Structure 1
Amino acid sequence: GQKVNPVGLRIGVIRDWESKWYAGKDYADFLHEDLKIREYISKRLSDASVSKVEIERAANRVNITIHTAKPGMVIGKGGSEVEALRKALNSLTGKRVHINILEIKRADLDAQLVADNIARQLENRVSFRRAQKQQIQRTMRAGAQGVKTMVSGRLGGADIARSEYYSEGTVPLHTLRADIDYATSEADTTYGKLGVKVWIYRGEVLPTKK
């Protein structure tokens, strides 16, 4: 029985360590600090869809370089909400963290925003074939080597085993030098927690040196 973290399988060999920091006589305040800031943007992203939240430890000041799909949706009205939740995070963890911003375009190349946004886009009464084919057409048509999205579990109520992993194109699932983006989310409708998991293997980088 196998299944593997694609996002942890390729991490550190071709993928990047999403949490950077020095370490450290006290790794505990770093670990819980990064989890708590990950839930800080996690709570502050009910409608922004920040597809990654990198925080950097910088000698008594965090550099929480929060990425975002749309810039001004979390970037505030020209500096209002970003300074507000930023300073509020400064009095939320204890370190005055000058949180930067990021503009993630190409939503078919963003894993958690496109898949999780497909899931909440399914939570509004959207069907399994309509949600999966619709995400395969928007993000599946957006440009990538292959995106395969499936919403596995409760959908339709009874006889709960439902695995429609509808997705096409090539997939470096076992190609260890592929560097695919593959993260899932969890939608919680009225029938039950019937979440979705999809990855979009955009393309590998050829190894070289000089």
Structure 2
Amino acid sequence: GQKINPIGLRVGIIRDWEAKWYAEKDFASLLHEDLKIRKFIDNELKEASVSHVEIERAANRINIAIHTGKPGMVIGKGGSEIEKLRNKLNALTDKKVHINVIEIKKVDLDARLVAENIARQLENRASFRRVQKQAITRAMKLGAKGIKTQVSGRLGGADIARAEQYSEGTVPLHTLRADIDYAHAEADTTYGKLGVKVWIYRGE
């Protein structure tokens, strides 16, 4: 297509892969097992808005690291909920796991977090325009070299598929030394689907 998710080209040059394990011809089993944990992630997504997870496969152990929106209750008061998450994952993937929760970068300047935020804000019957203004305001307040959020679909309870963009600063896409964070989200209340792609440009 005209525009392709840039993090597809970015990976393998400056940034690591979403999922990582040892190389062998039995990649089908590893990928079909990883898909189960990826689909299971939604349970923690719906309450902690975890951006993404890097999963590692040791000699016989599995290491993951979630980027939660807040670590306080994902780690629990004193570890009241991590053990049951580990047990559920062990049951589902038919293999144990080594959960290492790390809080996402303190500033809410990342991509998937704000993407889910604005998706839920739209689903809660709030003006996408005002939400975008707040998002870009706090984005430039926090300090970012470039940030744009696109939306598409039937906005504002309409029947017309229109698209909007609200960017700021220098945002080099064709440039490769950009170190960006492409995200996506889906939102609706009663009307179809409304996709949003948030782009973050932090440092070169």
- Normalising by the residue count of structure 2, what TM-score does the alignment of the two structures yield? 0.92
The answer (yes or no) to whether the contact 1:182–1:200 under 8 Å persists in 2 is yes
Is the 8 Å Cα contact of residues 115 and 184 (structure 1) preserved in structure 2? yes
Residue type of the partner of 1:13?
A: I
Counterpart mapping for 1:50-69 below 5 A: 50-69=50-69
Letter in 1 for 2:66: I
- Mapped to 1, the partners of 2:56 and 2:133 lie a distance apart of 38
Is the CA contact 1:70–1:105 (under 8 Å) kept in the aligned structure 2? no
| Partner-residue secondary structure (3-state), 2:149 | strand
After TM superposition, the structure 1 stretch with the greater mean CA deviation from structure 2, 7-16 or 91-100, is 7-16
- Given the superposition, is the C-alpha separation of residues 184 and 60 from structure 1 closer, same or farther in structure 2, using an over 3 Å criterion? same
Which blocks of at least 5 consecutive residues in structure 1 are unaligned? 205-210
1:137 maps to: 137
Note the 1:1-210 alignment, pairs <5 A. 2-204=2-204
Q: Distance in 2 between matches of 1:130 and 1:20?
A: 39
1:1-59 deviations in Å (ceiling 9; x for gaps): 51111111211122221211102131112111222111222222211011121111112
Are the counterparts in 2 of residues 72 and 78 from structure 1 also a CA contact under 8 Å?
A: no
For each residue in 1:46-97, what CA deviation from the matched residue of structure 2 results, as whole angstroms up to 9, or x when unmatched?
Answer: 1101112111111232112222121123222321211111111011111110
Alpha-carbon distance in structure 2 between the residues aligned to 1:140 and 1:153: 26
The residue number in structure 2 matching 1:207 is none
Structure 2 alignment gaps of length 5 or more: none
Q: Distance in 2 between matches of 1:38 and 1:107?
A: 25
Amino acid at match of 2:165: Y
- Point out the structure with the larger strand share: 2
Q: Please report the TM-score for the alignment, with normalisation by the length of structure 1.
A: 0.90
SS at match of 2:133: helix
CA–CA separation in structure 2 for the residues paired with 1:72 and 1:80: 11
In the alignment of these two chains, the number of paired residues is 204
Letter of the 1:76 partner, please give it. G
Equivalent residue letter for 1:65: A
Identity of counterpart residues, as a percentage?
A: 77
**What letter is aligned with 1:56?**
E
